[PDB]
Structure formats: C-alpha cells, structure tokens
C-alpha cells in the first residue's frame, strides 16, 4: 500500500513541475533543488520563483 502513497506524493508534487515549466525554467532540477532546500532548513514556505 505504500506504492499508492508514493504515487499520490508524486501526483500532487507535479504542480511545482508544471509551474516551473510554464515559467520557462527546467522543471525537474529546480523542483529537486527547492525540495532539498525545504528539507534542509525547516522552512516550508519555499516555492517556485
């Protein structure tokens, strides 16, 4: 049952990917970097510029 949970996580996390792609930036790398920033410093208010 964790497969469905991870699929849900990815599916809801596509929204920053679409946001960055619409913004012109590379989606995957920017999204991974901002996620790493969010997990390193406990500041959950970091989003796609």
């Amino acid at each position: 049952e964790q497969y469905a949970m991870r699929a849900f996580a990815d599916a809801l996390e596509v929204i920053p990917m679409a946001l960055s792609e619409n913004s012109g930036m590379n989606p995957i790398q920017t999204m991974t970097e901002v996620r790493a920033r969010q997990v390193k410093e406990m500041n959950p208010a970091l989003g796609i510029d």
């Binding site: 990917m17 792609e21 913004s23 012109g24 930036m25 590379n26 989606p27 995957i28 790398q29």
Partner: protein, 518 residues
C-alpha cells in the same frame, strides 16, 4: 529564462510514438512465458493461424502505426539474429519507451535520454556477461535443458520429452561440434504432412520426398543405387528449331523405329550401370519421361521418381552423395549415389511419402517430419521446432549460458539501479528509468501465471539483492526459487541481442520528431 520552443508538434509526435509502442507491447504481453497463451490471427482471406511466436503474431497482424511497424521489424530482426526472445525484445522496447515518456514530461532533451540509454545498455551487457557461466558442447544434458526451456512456452510443451532430444540431435548430426562457429538451418528440411498426432514426429538421417512413384509396380528397393538425371528421356530435339520431313511411306516406319531405338538405347545405358532407382529432374519444354521410356524402365525392373524441383538438387546431392548428370555419356556407377533402402510408405490414407534411408555415403543432413491432427497444430509445431533449432544455433554461435525465468533481467535491474545511484546529473534519472523498465519481464511472467506481480517482483529484488543470483520465478512451485536446480537455462546471445536491439531501435525512435504523409 530559456528557449521557448514554440513548436509543440514534435512533442505530440513523440508521445504518439511512445503510446503506440506501449500499446503494441501490451497487446502481446499476455503471450509470454510458459503460462502465456497463444494468439489467433485471421487475415483478410479466410485463413487462420494459432501463433505464439511474437514475430509471426506481429507480421500477420497488419499494423498501421509507424512505431508498430518499427517494432515488428525489430522483432523479425531479433528472430533472424537469435530465433528466441522475439516477444521479450518487443516487450522491453515498448516498456522502456513507456518509461521514457515521463522523462520527456520531466523536461529532458531526447538526446540525453538516448545517450544515457546507450550507457545503460553498455553496463547491462557487462552485467549479463558476468552473470553467465561457460557452456561447452557434447554435454547433452544442458542442451536438452535449453531445448526444453525454448519449447516450454509453446503448444508442443507436453511433447517436449519426445521432441526436444530429436531437436538437438538434428543440429548435432549436421555440424561438427569441434570447429563450427556457426550452423545452417537451410540443410534442416522440415517436412510437414497432415494426419496422425504429434507423438508421430520422426527424424530421418536420409532423404524425404513428397513426389510419387510413376511406375506403380515397384514400391520398395533394397540396396538402392540412386542416380539423378538432369536431361530428358524423350524423343530427341535440338535447342534450335527442330523439324522432320516425311516424303515416303517407309519413312513413317523408319522414324517410329528410330525413336523407339533411341529411347531404348538411353534406357539400356542407364540400366547397364547398375542403377536401380532413377530420379528425373522436373523439366519443362521437353517431356522428362515418355510413356514408352517409362514402359522400358518398368520392364528392366527399376523405380522412377520424376518431377524433382531444381532447387532441391543441392539438398539431394548433399544428402545421398550422388552427382547430377546432364549427359548420358557421363552416366557411370563410379559417381552414382548409393543407399541401403528406398521405400514408399502410405501414411494411413493421409499421403504417400518416399524415404531414402541408410545412405552408405556420409550425409551431413537430417530431415524432420511433423505430424498432427489439424493443420494449425502442425504449423505451430514446426515453428516451435524451428525455435528450438535457433536456440541451439545461438548456443553454437557463442558459448555462454545464463539462467531464465526472470532472473537475468531482474538482476540487471538491481545492478543498473545501483549504477544509476552513482551517476549524479540529468542522466541519473534516465539510467534509473532504464533499470526499472526491465522489471516488466518478471512482472509479466508473474501476472501471466496468476501470481501476485507486486509481491513476486519485490521478493525477487530482495533475493537478488542478497547476492542469491540465478533466482527466479518458478511456476511448478508457484513462487520464487533457484532456477538452475529447476533446469531452466537459455543462451546468453538471446538476451544480449534482445537488449542491444531494443536499445538501438528505441534510440532510433527517440530521434524522430515529425511524421509527414508522402
């Protein structure tokens, strides 16, 4: 910040190609492994076939998408190179294209994906080579194991005990197992006749003819002296225009007597060499056999076989050791083929079959006759025998043997995921996707057998992670077990050719960005 790439048609075309390839792969997904059940194809005309070979299924099915056509060409190329795995290669190609569709959605250039797939294939070939073990000929046990494994996923599986030993004996009786480096399947003549059951298949070291004996007075010959004929046993006629003019009443008697004497001369020269069975080549523009000639041949107690195809002369000469004659002056016993016995057998009212058996001269050729109730099982049986022969050809080509039942590709998936974890960059995701798109084969083997795909694949990954290599799906046990102890192995060339061909054709597909109607 970056290129706008206003054109969106390339993305649409790429996704259409990926979707078509995935659909084609899913179409034959359920026709893989021992538990996969074959497809039924009926073309425009009312002709049907019961096919389990992926190449045949894809060829008969008239597809319309360019990706599907490239996939069917891939399948036929894999059949040509190896002869087994023509379903698994298509499944792998479609599955990893479906894997790369999300890579395209993630904002990755197709060239990066193609190069990363090439690198992943390069690593995977080495992984497969390391996983293998050496295989050497004259070990009949492992050859029988490979033949049975090749035949397990076919309708003739229950006959494999009486059909795989002869399948490998056919190859072992054609090529020298010391210095071969290749074998030929042209000199393995598969002759099919309707009637009987599969358990009546036979392997003959001699020669098999579907022709019929002209003189219905002689049926069997002991200590046969076979002689091919390439000229014609009829009234003489020159290459250029031939004409005879008669001006007197005695001339008719003269021409009739002279023609009879000429034919009798030819038949006497044929008979005086000790030839007791004659083989006439199928000749046109000149009657190969005359009724008077056939009468004389029958009078001198001979057996005559006529209407023999031109392309079969090489096969007959290689089988029974005879040499063709195109002039009567060169017809001598010193170059006349010999055999222990020649028989004409009626097949329980289903046909008439000619056997030349016990050829004293050596014969580097065997013949398989396949029997079945209806025609569909006969076609599928000859296709399965061809698959087993191609497997033995793969074993002869390069001597490397690996395990099966999902073990090779799942071990490859583990090793390639571990390799991708040390490839930080934009290619890490691509190598990871390539690694995780080769778990489609174990998943398909699990779900086609009624097993639980998720738990089976997870337990397989766990087992191979601990280094318990050559561990795969077992359908007799209904679970996961060591496969080598279960006697299921396949040559390495099949897997390597499948992987390499799939990767190359996927790179070619990725290079496409547009389709235009001409």
């Amino acid at each position: 910040k970056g290129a706008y790439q206003d054109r969106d048609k390339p993305a649409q075309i790429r996704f259409s190609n990926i979707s078509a390839a995935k659909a084609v792969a899913d179409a034959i997904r359920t026709s893989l492994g021992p538990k996969g059940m074959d497809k039924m194809i009926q073309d425009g005309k009312g002709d049907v076939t019961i096919t389990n070979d992926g190449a045949t299924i894809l060829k008969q099915m008239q597809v319309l998408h360019p990706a599907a056509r490239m996939l069917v060409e891939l399948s036929k190329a894999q059949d040509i190179e190896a002869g087994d795995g023509t379903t698994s290669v298509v499944i792998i190609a479609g599955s990893l294209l479906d894997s790369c569709t999300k890579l395209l959605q993630k904002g990755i250039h197709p060239t990066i994906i193609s190069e990363s797939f090439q690198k992943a294939l390069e690593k995977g070939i080495e992984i497969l080579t390391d996983m293998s073990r050496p295989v050497e000929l004259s070990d009949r046990e492992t050859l029988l194991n490979s033949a049975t494994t090749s035949l397990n996923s076919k309708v003739v599986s229950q006959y494999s005990s009486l059909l795989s030993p002869m399948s490998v004996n056919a190859v072992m009786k054609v090529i020298d197992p010391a210095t071969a480096t290749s074998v030929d399947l042209r000199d393995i003549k598969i002759v099919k006749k309707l009637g009987g059951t599969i358990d009546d298949c036979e392997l003959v070291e001699g020669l098999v003819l579907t022709q019929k004996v002209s003189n219905s007075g002689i049926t069997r010959v002991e200590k046969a002296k076979i002689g091919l004929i390439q000229f014609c046993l009829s009234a003489p006629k020159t290459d250029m225009d031939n004409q005879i003019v008669v001006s007197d009443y005695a001339q008719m008697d003269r021409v009739l007597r002279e023609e009879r004497a000429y034919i009798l001369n030819l038949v006497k020269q044929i008979k005086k060499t000790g030839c007791n069975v004659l083989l006439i080549q199928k000749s046109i523009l000149r009657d190969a056999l005359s009724d008077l000639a056939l009468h004389f041949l029958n009078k001198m107690k001979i057996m005559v076989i006529k209407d023999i195809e031109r392309e079969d002369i090489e096969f007959i000469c290689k089988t029974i050791g005879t040499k063709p004659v195109a002039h009567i002056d060169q017809f001598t016993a010193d170059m006349l083929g010999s055999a222990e016995l020649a028989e004409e057998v009626n097949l329980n009212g289903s046909g008439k079959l000619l056997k030349i058996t016990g050829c004293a001269s050596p014969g580097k050729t065997v013949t398989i006759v396949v029997r079945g109730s209806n025609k569909l099982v006969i076609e599928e049986a000859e296709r399965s025998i061809h698959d087993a022969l191609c497997v033995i050809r793969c074993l002869v080509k390069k001597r490397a043997l690996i395990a099966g039942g999902g073990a090779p590709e799942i071990e490859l998936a583990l090793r390639l995921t571990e390799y991708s974890r040390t490839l930080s960059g934009m290619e890490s995701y691509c190598v990871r996707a390539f690694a995780d798109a080769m778990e489609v084969i174990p998943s398909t083997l699990a779900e086609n057998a009624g097993l639980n795909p998720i738990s089976t694949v997870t337990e397989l990954r766990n087992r191979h992670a601990q280094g318990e290599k050559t561990a795969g799906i077992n359908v007799r046990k209904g679970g996961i077990s060591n496969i080598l102890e279960e006697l299921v192995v396949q040559p390495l060339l099949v897997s390597v050719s499948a992987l390499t061909l799939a990767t190359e054709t996927v790179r070619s597909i990725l290079k496409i960005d547009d389709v235009v109607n001409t």
